[PDB]
Amino acid sequence: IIETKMLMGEVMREAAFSLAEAKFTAGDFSTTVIQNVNKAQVKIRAKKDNVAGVTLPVFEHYHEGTDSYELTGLARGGEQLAKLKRNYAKAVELLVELA
Amino acid sequence: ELFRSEEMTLAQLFLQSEAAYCCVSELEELGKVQFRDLNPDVNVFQR
Amino acid sequence: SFFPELYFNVDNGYLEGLVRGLKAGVLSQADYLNLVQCETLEDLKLHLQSTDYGNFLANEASPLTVSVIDDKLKEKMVVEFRHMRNHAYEPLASFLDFITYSYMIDNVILLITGTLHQRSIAELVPKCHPLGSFEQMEAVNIAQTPAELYNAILVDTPLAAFFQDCISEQDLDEMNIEIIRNTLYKAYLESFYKFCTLLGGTTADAMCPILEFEADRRAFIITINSFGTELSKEDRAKLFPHCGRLYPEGLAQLARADDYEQVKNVADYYPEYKLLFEGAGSNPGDKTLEDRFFEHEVKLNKLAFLNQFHFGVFYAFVKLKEQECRNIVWIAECIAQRHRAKIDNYIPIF
Amino acid sequence: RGKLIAVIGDEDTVTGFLLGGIGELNKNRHPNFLVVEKDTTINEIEDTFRQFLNRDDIGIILINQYIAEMVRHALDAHQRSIPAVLEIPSKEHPYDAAKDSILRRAKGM
């Protein structure tokens, strides 16, 4: 947990800076992102882990595929928003393990 | 007089900090002294 | 030639001088370096106070935030543009209104997005860009009816002309908001280019290059971003503005394009864009294609100031100040996030 | 049927998480995210956080360090494990290992 918190200290920073760069080209896309929610593209699945006789709950990182932010930077955002999406997917991959 | 501008000259003053305020106040009253910025490297809002 | 020298200053000379004076206040390279050398957002404000910006940020709360700085820059530009528009006459008034249509497009997109998601239009108003404010009350208190909102746009908004590209109000719920936005922008850019050409003279000469580059960059970026999406080539080609220099077979090759290599091959035929694509390494640590296009756009807007008797000065100034505000916001972001390494990514102006 | 992820943070963090693909609107159209603007107060954050915890399908919850400090009492009160609460950094305030609700159980750190 300590190691994962330290590594988050960097992954979250990288994702936030990718967002800052995204706002450089795409502009103010936060309102569009928040308004167009529709259905979550990433859900979680419960899993069981066993230590001695004690069962430890854990989580599974699982995709739905119901993307809703495609074309979001069709004209101006493009690469920066795609990179930002990838960085925050990586951050979610870190934080699911942390959880 | 008005024939041509007055003889102008630079000058520099050493004055101890304690008396500096009073001295510059006397200068302000007198009115014949024009100071100049001597620390332009740092902006006015940080002096 | 139209000889604008004879009559431009009759109505728009005072505003020409005023906008040039405003442009003289855009931060230069030395000022950008000074702001870059700061350590905190408070020091950023301190250094900025020596530029034309002055005390625009003295009133606001001591714990400065990038959001606060960005909103204040936006407010300042909105105030200056609104003053110029209020002092402008018919032709320049229409030019400035065309400049504002760009943000009105995004605002109407926001309105329809919220309405289709059953959210109060009055509550959507605050997020809209100030330069595209829908002061008309026909598009307010819509009761969350997309049909009523479409009728309001058609009746009491300058976007009625661009909304004839669609066929009906059912299109609002049928087509994706991004496609609606880009179709609206294609129509708006085409109409803007037509208006500038009709104005002719130095206005057309100094403005058509900017709109042409806008069209070409829109084509390139739409192609490069629609590769992995469900956006088909046929529906993509409808989003390329026809003003650019790619109209004969260039836009067609882009529509048939199926890869960034093909997009680059298409761009090769035009040397101006060839250099931008060559410099757009796109790998980490070097300028991206969007950054190269930003540099070219800034260059064109600066060259717009070598002509004298033309309205293109105002569009160029608006875009240059938009870029400057983006640069200052980026510098503040770098200061706040401590990522000084990328602090040079700002595109300099003058 | 699977659980979701919930976010309570600044608009930028919420936007990044939505791009990550975390938000959804359920049958009753309740969002599973919140942007903490200045217009929002401690009572509002506490109420929405309690709603998040009560919801049985929430799964993971993410909170900025400063928001967690603001609503720390609710975090400490929440003791069961399944609603996995995480404290995350922000551009406004950095993340520090100390004073973390989960780490409160550790003295060997």
From TrEMBL, chain A:
Major localisation: membrane
Any GO BP: cilium assembly
GO CC annotation, single: cilium
Subcellular location: Cytoplasmic vesicle, Clathrin-coated vesicle membrane
GO molecular function, one term: proton-transporting ATPase activity, rotational mechanism
Keyword Zinc-finger (UniProt): no
Keywords from the named record: Ion transport, Membrane, Transmembrane, Transmembrane helix, Transport
Domain of life (superkingdom): Eukaryota
Record keyword Membrane present: yes
Subunit organization: V-ATPase is a heteromultimeric enzyme made up of two complexes: the ATP-hydrolytic V1 complex and the proton translocation V0 complex. The V1 complex consists of three catalytic AB heterodimers that form a heterohexamer, three peripheral stalks each consisting of EG heterodimers, one central rotor including subunits D and F, and the regulatory subunits C and H. The proton translocation complex V0 consists of the proton transport subunit a, a ring of proteolipid subunits c9c'', rotary subunit d, subunits e and f, and the accessory subunits ATP6AP1/Ac45 and ATP6AP2/PRR. Interacts with SNX10.
Function per UniProt: Subunit of the V1 complex of vacuolar(H+)-ATPase (V-ATPase), a multisubunit enzyme composed of a peripheral complex (V1) that hydrolyzes ATP and a membrane integral complex (V0) that translocates protons. V-ATPase is responsible for acidifying and maintaining the pH of intracellular compartments and in some cell types, is targeted to the plasma membrane, where it is responsible for acidifying the extracellular environment. May play a role in cilium biogenesis through regulation of the transport and the localization of proteins to the cilium.
Family, similarity comment: Belongs to the V-ATPase D subunit family.
Designated name of the protein: V-type proton ATPase subunit D
Gene source species: Rattus norvegicus
Name of the encoding gene: Atp6v1d
UniProtKB/TrEMBL annotation, chain C:
Gene that encodes it: Atp6v0d1
A GO CC term assigned to this protein in UniProt: clathrin-coated vesicle membrane
Predominant location: membrane
Molecular functions (GO terms): proton-transporting ATPase activity, rotational mechanism
SUPFAM superfamilies: V-type ATP synthase subunit C (SSF103486)
Its membrane topology: Peripheral membrane protein
Name of the protein in question: V-type proton ATPase subunit
Cell compartment(s), UniProt: Cytoplasmic vesicle, Clathrin-coated vesicle membrane; Lysosome membrane
Family named by the database record: Belongs to the V-ATPase V0D/AC39 subunit family.
Assembly notes: V-ATPase is a heteromultimeric enzyme made up of two complexes: the ATP-hydrolytic V1 complex and the proton translocation V0 complex. The V1 complex consists of three catalytic AB heterodimers that form a heterohexamer, three peripheral stalks each consisting of EG heterodimers, one central rotor including subunits D and F, and the regulatory subunits C and H. The proton translocation complex V0 consists of the proton transport subunit a, a ring of proteolipid subunits c9c'', rotary subunit d, subunits e and f, and the accessory subunits ATP6AP1/Ac45 and ATP6AP2/PRR.
Assigned keywords, A-Z: Hydrogen ion transport, Ion transport, Transport
GO term, biological process aspect, one: homeostatic process
Main function: Subunit of the V0 complex of vacuolar(H+)-ATPase (V-ATPase), a multisubunit enzyme composed of a peripheral complex (V1) that hydrolyzes ATP and a membrane integral complex (V0) that translocates protons. V-ATPase is responsible for acidifying and maintaining the pH of intracellular compartments and in some cell types, is targeted to the plasma membrane, where it is responsible for acidifying the extracellular environment.
